Amino acid sequence: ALRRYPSGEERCIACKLCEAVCPAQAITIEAEERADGSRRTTRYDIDMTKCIYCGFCQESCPVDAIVESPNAEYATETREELLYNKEKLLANGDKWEPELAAAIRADAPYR
Amino acid sequence: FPAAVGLFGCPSTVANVETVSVAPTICRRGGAWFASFGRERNHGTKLFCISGHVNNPCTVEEEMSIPMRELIEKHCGGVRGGWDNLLAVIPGGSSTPILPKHICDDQLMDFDALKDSQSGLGTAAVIVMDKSTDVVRAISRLSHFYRHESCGQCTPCREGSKWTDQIMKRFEKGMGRPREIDMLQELTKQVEGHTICALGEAFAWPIQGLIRHFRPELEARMKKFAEETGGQALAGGWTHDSRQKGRLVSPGM
Amino acid sequence: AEVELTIDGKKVSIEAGSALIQACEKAGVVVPRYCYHEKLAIAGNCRMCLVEVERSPKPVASCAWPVQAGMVVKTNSPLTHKAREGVMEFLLANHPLDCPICDQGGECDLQDQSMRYGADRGRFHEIGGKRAVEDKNIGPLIKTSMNRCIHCTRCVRFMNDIAGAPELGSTGRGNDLQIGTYLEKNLDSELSGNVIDLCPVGALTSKPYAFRARPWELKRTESIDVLDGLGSNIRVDSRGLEVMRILPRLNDDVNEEWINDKTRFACDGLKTQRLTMPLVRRDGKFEPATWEQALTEIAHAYQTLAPKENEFKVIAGQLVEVESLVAMKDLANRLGSENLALDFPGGSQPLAHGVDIRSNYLFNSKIWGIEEADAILLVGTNPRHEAAVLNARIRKQWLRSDLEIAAVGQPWESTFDYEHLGTDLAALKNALSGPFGEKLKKAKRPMIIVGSGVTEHPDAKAFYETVWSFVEKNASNFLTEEWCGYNVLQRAASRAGAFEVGFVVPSPEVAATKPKFVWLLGADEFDPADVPKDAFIVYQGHHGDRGAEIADIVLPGAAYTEKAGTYVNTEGRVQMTRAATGLPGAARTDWKIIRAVSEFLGVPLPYDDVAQLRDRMAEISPALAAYDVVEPVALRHLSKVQLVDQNKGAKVTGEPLKKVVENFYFTDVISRSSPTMARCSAAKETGDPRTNFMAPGMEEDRPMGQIAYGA
Amino acid sequence: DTLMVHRNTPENNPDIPFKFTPENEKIIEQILKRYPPQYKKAAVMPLLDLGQRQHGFCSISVMNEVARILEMPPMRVYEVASFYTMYNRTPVGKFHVQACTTTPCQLGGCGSDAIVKAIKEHLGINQGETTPDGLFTFIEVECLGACVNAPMVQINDDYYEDLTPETIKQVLTALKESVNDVSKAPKPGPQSGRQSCENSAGLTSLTSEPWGPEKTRPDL
Amino acid sequence: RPSFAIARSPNEQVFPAGAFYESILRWNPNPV
Amino acid sequence: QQFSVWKDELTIYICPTGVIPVFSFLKYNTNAEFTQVSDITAVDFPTREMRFEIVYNLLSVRHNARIRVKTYADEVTPVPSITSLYMGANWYEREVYDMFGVLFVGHPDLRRIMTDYGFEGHPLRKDFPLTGYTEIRYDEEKKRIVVEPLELTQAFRNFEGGSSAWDQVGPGIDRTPDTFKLPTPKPE
Amino acid sequence: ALPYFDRLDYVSMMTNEQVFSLAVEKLLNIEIPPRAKFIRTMFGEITRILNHLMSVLSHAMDVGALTPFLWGFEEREKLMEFYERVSGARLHAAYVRPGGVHQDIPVGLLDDIYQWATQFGDRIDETEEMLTDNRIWINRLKGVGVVSAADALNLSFTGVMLRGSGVPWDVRKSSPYDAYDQVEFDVPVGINGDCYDRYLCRMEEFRQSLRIIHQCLNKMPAGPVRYEDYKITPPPRAAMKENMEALIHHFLLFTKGYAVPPGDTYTAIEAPKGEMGVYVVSDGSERPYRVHIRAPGFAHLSGFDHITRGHLLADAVAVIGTMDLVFGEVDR
Amino acid sequence: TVRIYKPAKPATQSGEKNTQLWRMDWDVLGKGHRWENPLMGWQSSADFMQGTHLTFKTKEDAIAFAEKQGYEYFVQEPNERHFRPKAYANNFLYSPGKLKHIRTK
Numbered sequence A: 001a002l003r004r005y006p007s008g009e010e011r012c013i014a015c016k017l018c019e020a021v022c023p024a025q026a027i028t029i030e031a032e033e034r035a036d037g038s039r040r041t042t043r044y045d046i047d048m049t050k051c052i053y054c055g056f057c058q059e060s061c062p063v064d065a066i067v068e069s070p071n072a073e074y075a076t077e078t079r080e081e082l083l084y085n086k087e088k089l090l091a092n093g094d095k096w097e098p099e100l101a102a103a104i105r106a107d108a109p110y111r
Numbered sequence B: 001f002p003a004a005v006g007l008f009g010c011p012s013t014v015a016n017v018e019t020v021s022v023a024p025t026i027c028r029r030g031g032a033w034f035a036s037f038g039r040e041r042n043h044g045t046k047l048f049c050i051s052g053h054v055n056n057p058c059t060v061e062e063e064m065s066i067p068m069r070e071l072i073e074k075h076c077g078g079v080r081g082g083w084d085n086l087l088a089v090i091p092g093g094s095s096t097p098i099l100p101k102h103i104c105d106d107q108l109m110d111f112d113a114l115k116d117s118q119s120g121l122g123t124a125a126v127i128v129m130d131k132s133t134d135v136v137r138a139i140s141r142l143s144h145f146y147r148h149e150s151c152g153q154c155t156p157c158r159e160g161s162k163w164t165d166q167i168m169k170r171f172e173k174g175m176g177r178p179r180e181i182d183m184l185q186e187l188t189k190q191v192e193g194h195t196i197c198a199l200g201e202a203f204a205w206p207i208q209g210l211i212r213h214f215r216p217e218l219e220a221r222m223k224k225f226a227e228e229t230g231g232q233a234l235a236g237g238w239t240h241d242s243r244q245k246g247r248l249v250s251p252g253m
Numbered sequence C: 001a002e003v004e005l006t007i008d009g010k011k012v013s014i015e016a017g018s019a020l021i022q023a024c025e026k027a028g029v030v031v032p033r034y035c036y037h038e039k040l041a042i043a044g045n046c047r048m049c050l051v052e053v054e055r056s057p058k059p060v061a062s063c064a065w066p067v068q069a070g071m072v073v074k075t076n077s078p079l080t081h082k083a084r085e086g087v088m089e090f091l092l093a094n095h096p097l098d099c100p101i102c103d104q105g106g107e108c109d110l111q112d113q114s115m116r117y118g119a120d121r122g123r124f125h126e127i128g129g130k131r132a133v134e135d136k137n138i139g140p141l142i143k144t145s146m147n148r149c150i151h152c153t154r155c156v157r158f159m160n161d162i163a164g165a166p167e168l169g170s171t172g173r174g175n176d177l178q179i180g181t182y183l184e185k186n187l188d189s190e191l192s193g194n195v196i197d198l199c200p201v202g203a204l205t206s207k208p209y210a211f212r213a214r215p216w217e218l219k220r221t222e223s224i225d226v227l228d229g230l231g232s233n234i235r236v237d238s239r240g241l242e243v244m245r246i247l248p249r250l251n252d253d254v255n256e257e258w259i260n261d262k263t264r265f266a267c268d269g270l271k272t273q274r275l276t277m278p279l280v281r282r283d284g285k286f287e288p289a290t291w292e293q294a295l296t297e298i299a300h301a302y303q304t305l306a307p308k309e310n311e312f313k314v315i316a317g318q319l320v321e322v323e324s325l326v327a328m329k330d331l332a333n334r335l336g337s338e339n340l341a342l343d344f345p346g347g348s349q350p351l352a353h354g355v356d357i358r359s360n361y362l363f364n365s366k367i368w369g370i371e372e373a374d375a376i377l378l379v380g381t382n383p384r385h386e387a388a389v390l391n392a393r394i395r396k397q398w399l400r401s402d403l404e405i406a407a408v409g410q411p412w413e414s415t416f417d418y419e420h421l422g423t424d425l426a427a428l429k430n431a432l433s434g435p436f437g438e439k440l441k442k443a444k445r446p447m448i449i450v451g452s453g454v455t456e457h458p459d460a461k462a463f464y465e466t467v468w469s470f471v472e473k474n475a476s477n478f479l480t481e482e483w484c485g486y487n488v489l490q491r492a493a494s495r496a497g498a499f500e501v502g503f504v505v506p507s508p509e510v511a512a513t514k515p516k517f518v519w520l521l522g523a524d525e526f527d528p529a530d531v532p533k534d535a536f537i538v539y540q541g542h543h544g545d546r547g548a549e550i551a552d553i554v555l556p557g558a559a560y561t562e563k564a565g566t567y568v569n570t571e572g573r574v575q576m577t578r579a580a581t582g583l584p585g586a587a588r589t590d591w592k593i594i595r596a597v598s599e600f601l602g603v604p605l606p607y608d609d610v611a612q613l614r615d616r617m618a619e620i621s622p623a624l625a626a627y628d629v630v631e632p633v634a635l636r637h638l639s640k641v642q643l644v645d646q647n648k649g650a651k652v653t654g655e656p657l658k659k660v661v662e663n664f665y666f667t668d669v670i671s672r673s674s675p676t677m678a679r680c681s682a683a684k685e686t687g688d689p690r691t692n693f694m695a696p697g698m699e700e701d702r703p704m705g706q707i708a709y710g711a
Numbered sequence D: 001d002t003l004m005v006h007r008n009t010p011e012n013n014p015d016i017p018f019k020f021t022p023e024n025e026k027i028i029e030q031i032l033k034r035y036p037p038q039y040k041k042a043a044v045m046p047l048l049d050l051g052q053r054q055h056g057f058c059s060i061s062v063m064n065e066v067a068r069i070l071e072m073p074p075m076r077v078y079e080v081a082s083f084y085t086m087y088n089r090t091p092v093g094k095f096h097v098q099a100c101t102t103t104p105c106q107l108g109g110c111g112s113d114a115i116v117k118a119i120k121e122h123l124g125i126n127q128g129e130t131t132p133d134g135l136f137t138f139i140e141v142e143c144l145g146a147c148v149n150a151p152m153v154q155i156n157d158d159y160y161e162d163l164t165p166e167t168i169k170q171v172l173t174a175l176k177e178s179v180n181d182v183s184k185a186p187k188p189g190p191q192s193g194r195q196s197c198e199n200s201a202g203l204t205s206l207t208s209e210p211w212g213p214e215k216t217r218p219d220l
Numbered sequence E: 001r002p003s004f005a006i007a008r009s010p011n012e013q014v015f016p017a018g019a020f021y022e023s024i025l026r027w028n029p030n031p032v
Numbered sequence F: 001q002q003f004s005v006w007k008d009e010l011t012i013y014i015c016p017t018g019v020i021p022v023f024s025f026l027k028y029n030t031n032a033e034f035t036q037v038s039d040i041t042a043v044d045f046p047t048r049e050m051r052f053e054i055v056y057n058l059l060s061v062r063h064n065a066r067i068r069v070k071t072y073a074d075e076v077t078p079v080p081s082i083t084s085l086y087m088g089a090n091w092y093e094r095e096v097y098d099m100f101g102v103l104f105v106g107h108p109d110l111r112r113i114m115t116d117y118g119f120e121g122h123p124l125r126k127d128f129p130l131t132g133y134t135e136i137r138y139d140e141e142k143k144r145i146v147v148e149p150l151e152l153t154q155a156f157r158n159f160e161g162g163s164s165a166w167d168q169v170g171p172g173i174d175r176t177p178d179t180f181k182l183p184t185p186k187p188e
Numbered sequence G: 001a002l003p004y005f006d007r008l009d010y011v012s013m014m015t016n017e018q019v020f021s022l023a024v025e026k027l028l029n030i031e032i033p034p035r036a037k038f039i040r041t042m043f044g045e046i047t048r049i050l051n052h053l054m055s056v057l058s059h060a061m062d063v064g065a066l067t068p069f070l071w072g073f074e075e076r077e078k079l080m081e082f083y084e085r086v087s088g089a090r091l092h093a094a095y096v097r098p099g100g101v102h103q104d105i106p107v108g109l110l111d112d113i114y115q116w117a118t119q120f121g122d123r124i125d126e127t128e129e130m131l132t133d134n135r136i137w138i139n140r141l142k143g144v145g146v147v148s149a150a151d152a153l154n155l156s157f158t159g160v161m162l163r164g165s166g167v168p169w170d171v172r173k174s175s176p177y178d179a180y181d182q183v184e185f186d187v188p189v190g191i192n193g194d195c196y197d198r199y200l201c202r203m204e205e206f207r208q209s210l211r212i213i214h215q216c217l218n219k220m221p222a223g224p225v226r227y228e229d230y231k232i233t234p235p236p237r238a239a240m241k242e243n244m245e246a247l248i249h250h251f252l253l254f255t256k257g258y259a260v261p262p263g264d265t266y267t268a269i270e271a272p273k274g275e276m277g278v279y280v281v282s283d284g285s286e287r288p289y290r291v292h293i294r295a296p297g298f299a300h301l302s303g304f305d306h307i308t309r310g311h312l313l314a315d316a317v318a319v320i321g322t323m324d325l326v327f328g329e330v331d332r
Numbered sequence H: 001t002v003r004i005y006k007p008a009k010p011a012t013q014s015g016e017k018n019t020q021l022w023r024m025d026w027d028v029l030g031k032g033h034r035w036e037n038p039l040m041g042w043q044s045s046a047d048f049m050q051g052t053h054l055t056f057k058t059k060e061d062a063i064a065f066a067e068k069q070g071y072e073y074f075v076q077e078p079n080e081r082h083f084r085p086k087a088y089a090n091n092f093l094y095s096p097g098k099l100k101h102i103r104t105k
């Protein structure tokens, strides 16, 4: 899931750290300057059929932007449905934010 | 070195006013006569600025190696409140380290004795402070002076003169833990000898003297702060409840 | 002479008068540095090079410490270790925690030397906070995040000493010291983008390459700049099929760690107006076509015309490699044509210098010869616009020696003082026999640089015999064993290579014949008089520009970033470009387009692998086989027969020497397609210091932003 | 709130013209001859002060004029004028009050803190601004070199020294009244008896007649 | 917005030249 | 030829033709009772004339000791098999052969152990590409699995270029016993 | 490369990543803190119990006893809750890393393992009620897959395959690693070298691993669970968001990685399936020049012909289960 | 064809660790190196050698390997610096005549 701030801005600033550390090269990021001059991603794809669910992407984030929700129930029909683009990962964060914020609140001291 | 490549890349010498101004007399009166005054390596007379907490502050010229005691209550009317009401003397100006009461009792004012006392004569701008003044506030106003006078050319002074200035305002309030005092000691050792010019030592020496002779004072103010807010502050000035209040607190401070 | 000394035990042999950091490099010892740069003046500000020297109570700054005949240097002693951690702690106390949002991330010297010589954790926790400084508007190309400044002074030293553009400074004092023009100004220097590479940190970044890539994800290719005649050595960093940025690579013989702004920013013009499929002009509209039936309509048109001798004409553009010149030379020859023109005006007539001796048209005292030049006469050349990196090398020698510069031509805005002698040919004859001539006659290693802009002057035949007759009159000074004071300066990367393979018009007779068929081989700067209107025009290139506008066929070739072409720089050095990406769309390698249209016209050029075509180039000129080297000219005295003997009766007209570069930003098709050069011109014209001038970002008059870049 | 970058202003913009008056260039000429002829860039410091004493502060136009007199890039002059504190790059009051707050003044005699307190309450302004009538701009400064005469406050070019809360007020008021009649301008130096720096309770030394050349070595 | 001691006319003298600059005029290296 | 010692590890460097004698001595000596092969593998160094380093790791349960034996091989230069001494070494040499191409003279049944049946190449060679040269799929028209040249929907992104421009480990520290250093000549 | 080790022997995950961490830590020349030493030895024995629950009960499921399998997979189901509390994975934790462990254990886990501990012996005893004295079980493992002590060594056998023929040898006792030198435990060594001995040795290790876990709970020291050096292990999130040096060390560890000094090491541990070792060549850079895994089952399957020769096929299915065989281990 | 060369130091930084070893890499071809994936926009490839590079200690070690494997190879000779003594003292050399430069630290 891709999360926001309380304001509503995306937390992601396109550092690409989660792309460098990916053990399976499952993340593809393309960034540029947004209309307002902010450093933001234009592409954010996660191959759910390449990913090993290690959690490394979320340990490396400096802004808690990428997380792994507790959702394990999302079998799909086609594997095209398993190519998450930035429109799906943001939609996931909007959906799961209370539970994401809660899990972060529990584990942050240990992180 | 400027004796070769100095002003406009020409051979030059820089000498202070008072050193230059005494040359014509020593020529016409003789260097032996000059060497009559002072100790073996501390000859001559010299001009002393006696400022601060004395009854009559002024400037008078006097023979080198005059004892500090002999000087202030004979040429300046005495320290305010009497000798026993002295606390500390900055002997050579802001750059030289502060010198407490019991070291300044039998101290001669020259180059060698002050260097022996882990201090200096500097320009003998003898700043004398009373027993009824905030010593720590006096030294934090100097580390503020040195923050404003740094040229900014080199790293250890342009960054360090501000870092120590921010630390000194904290120790003024007591907003720290006593381990910060040791951290400030070795921050200054990181400054000496690493800078292009001697303005680096100029702000490291005063702090080192204050830690060396007034560490009980600083830890008391921390204790007074640690009493008031409810615990020893984190290193950096944040209060003990900082993590409770949901602030950035790295493990260790 | 050589002093000898020990560093960490080991003896190093370094010349006397050099700095210790130079001997540490020679001894195989890594010394951390931020302020010191090999090509900039010594500054002792960073304090990261502090080493322990025997008989010295303090650590010394190795960068500023001269080497002495017997000193001992410990670079790994406990004195050195605590010195480096203390400096690394100070350099990071006020540094912004902006590594995820910094463009210097992953390629930062502050990060790497913090990992290698610093402490693992930091002790700065002030409630009072860190320093913060406002950003500065210093033109369109450079984005500023000044909180990151570590005060190395590398850019003020570069802009003041190498670029000759003293508008960057350091205002303020102490911790509040700041880098930038006090009053916002647009840094006006064709070398200003070098400040971005010089910055140890990302306080000076490039607005085009704003947040697009991370250094680790870039494929690095060592190639050549073809946007000028100097052949500058570069690194092309690409992520897949898109070139991200172009950086400078070291070559002390050519460009020395520096590239100009055109060669660094014009790469965004490589993805904007590309020819990606064959085009045929049908009923006045360009229709798409396949290769098999665009090469056919080339042949059908050629058969219909049935051209006579020299009626098939070629014009070679300024980005054309030598492989396709040799191939198009052959196919031209098998068609009975020697009509081999060049893009510039006067290029369809024979040139005032010949091509018979290599020394006729080359920069003979090589680019490295300036480092010892004593007097220089510039004729018909604004070198700041025509050869930017070369211009800087002239100033470096001028600033450190008693160098005298005089120019005949149009006055320009120079980064070095120069005497102006005149603008026409008489002002050359009057100069060469005037006061400045005896400077050339007296001063050892004299240097006369003749701009390629006089070759297109009508009086070039008179200009070229004027120069060389002075050279021949003044040998043993101009023409010694190892020196040649005659130098012709190319401004397009294709001219020296065309001259080397003899790709020129041979005689006035072939020049006056009207062609029925013109192959514009990457040619876009042709004069209208050199293409007859009714002719049959084939355009082979990579960018849709003037050439494709008039074509009857358009054939898409490759840009220099996806071919391994051979190019010859103005000094005669034969270099090879490396393809960084592949061909886009249906484009084809340029020499292969020629070789295929040989089948369709029935005269197949023999070679059909590029290895074979390089064997053919070896027959035309063997120097073309020698790579990354200049081959010296042997019969350098034979040059009189073209320059003076065949230029004897010259019809002088007296027209003054003309400027060749109206717009340094808009010189070629890659540049003209570039959005970044669009902003560089517009900012130059209106004098706008704003970084977001035609770019994304919030403004006073754009509260909302803008997604257009370049407009 | 001193800034180290130029803020464009209707009173500080490059388009406003500056030129040294038909009387100043005489001062300029004498200053220039005191340095090597090619090192005239040494004169940048004197002309910036001359420029700001004719205009009021070191304006961007003032600095730019001093650049062309000395054939310098103007950015070389901006770095100087931004480095040295005495140059004012923003308009100031008629009287630029400079109170020293360094340790010796903070302890010397009565502390400087009352002197700042007296200035603040009498001038009705805080640190670094000017008074609404635009006559007094008050800032605090580092040691001014009159430490044995602590506390001291210099105004334009003069040192009103050895100050007390009562004495600093009247020194400031008469200065305000000095805008009309120069007769009421307060005398410089210290108050309360001391001439320059002597002992305040009788001279401890230098009482006998001075010794002349009579005691000189005979060989010379 | 408050008035400042800024020269109004181009030939106005906002601050006096003072003693030091006044004595520079009298300087002459030639002995008298 | 030589021996190295790092911390608790003693390595012996041997000639390829000495394989049978050396391992016999280390198997059947009363002070060298190294009766297990733990592992035999290869490392590839294409900058050497002999590309392949053959590493054997041996265990002595009697003396609670370990020893490493290194030899070298080439694309054409074979190594003696030691399945005459250790039955457990048989499959290990099949792996080294299968993965590197090294050929073991004397081995019974030196066949591939890991790769597919008609596989061409030696994947642990450093010239061999990570994704190989071929891929497989099911062909509906041919009713079988067929073998094709390799295409990748996403090309593999190799982030090696992000290695620090600065060396990060340094030279280390020498830690030889004084019993194995040359005596120094005392002065005078 | 550390997650690759979870997927070698996929029933013994945290001990696969232990041998890779111990190898890298040896080239790093670092000493990991005491708390991570005990965390690793506790979760290495929780792992050993987990593997033996798979190995023993799947072996008896092949032999045709089907009920002990289900009972002990609830015991397996409970012991994977402890994996998912320290990490967030039921199978591939990635928890053990060079320099210690990724995260500190949660604040009520050592109580929950003790509550599991109080009853786990009763689970072994009831599993032992069904197999140990059962004559059908005895008559399907006695004399089956018999290897001599001399041949087990010559065949590269380790672990209970080595130990069931009467060779007393455990890597934990002979080359102690982690907190094993700090714990008291015994080593079951068989007599007749057959499948019945290797079954009885594995059941005894159930009781010995439980005896170690209880000792680890009582000696759990306080302090970092991660090597206290940010050039090697990632800084805390709170430091990275507050201190300059910490964000630099955070950034470079997740992009370039830490450099390992040059050299090679062969490192072995006492894995649940035998001896597991890795040979790592380092080039002084941030990526391994060569990683070679020594898998105990690879050597065991190589000696299957020498051991099953002359036996029946119903005998060979018993020999397959007594050799602890996960084929992701064998093929790497 | 493969290119054997010594990588140039980055313009962006002063570390030279990556310039110390010779690299052998494969040249990009005109087709098959990268194309855009129609579905996700990813970059697809047919070049099996695109991510493979070899490191060698000497130039002749790389040439020996190239000829052993039958590669076509182009060797690029390193570009090296030209030594020149640099002196902090020059920053303050004296000009008898016109300055022609205002050094600004």
Ligand code: SF4
Pocket: A011, A012, A013, A014, A015, A016, A017, A018, A019, A029, A060, A061, A062, A063, A064, A065, A066
């Ligand atoms: S999700 Fe986090 S790590 Fe990934 S690109 Fe965005 S900011 Fe960087």
Ligand code: SF4
Pocket: A018, A021, A022, A023, A024, A025, A026, A027, A046, A050, A051, A052, A053, A054, A055, A056, A057, A058
């Ligand atoms: S959890 Fe998946 S997406 Fe995240 S780093 Fe690991 S493999 Fe990549």
Ligand code: SF4
Pocket: B149, B150, B151, B152, B153, B154, B155, B157, B158, B195, B196, B197, B198, B199, B200
């Ligand atoms: S120590 Fe001297 S040179 Fe260095 S910053 Fe301070 S004042 Fe400047």
Ligand code: SF4
Pocket: C095, C096, C097, C098, C099, C100, C102, C103, C104, C105, C106, C108, C109, C110, C111, C148, C200, C201, C202, C203, G248
């Ligand atoms: S300049 Fe370097 S250290 Fe500073 S924020 Fe950018 S990447 Fe980090």
Ligand code: SF4
Pocket: C148, C149, C150, C151, C152, C153, C154, C155, C156, C179, C198, C199, C200, C201, C203, C204
């Ligand atoms: S902007 Fe960059 S190059 Fe210029 S002084 Fe600051 S850190 Fe150095």
Ligand code: FES
Pocket: C032, C033, C034, C035, C036, C043, C044, C045, C046, C047, C048, C049, C061, C062, C063, C064
């Ligand atoms: S390298 Fe010598 S001080 Fe920066």
Ligand code: FES
Pocket: D100, D101, D102, D103, D104, D105, D142, D143, D144, D145, D146, D147, D150, D152
């Ligand atoms: S302290 Fe105020 S004058 Fe020196």
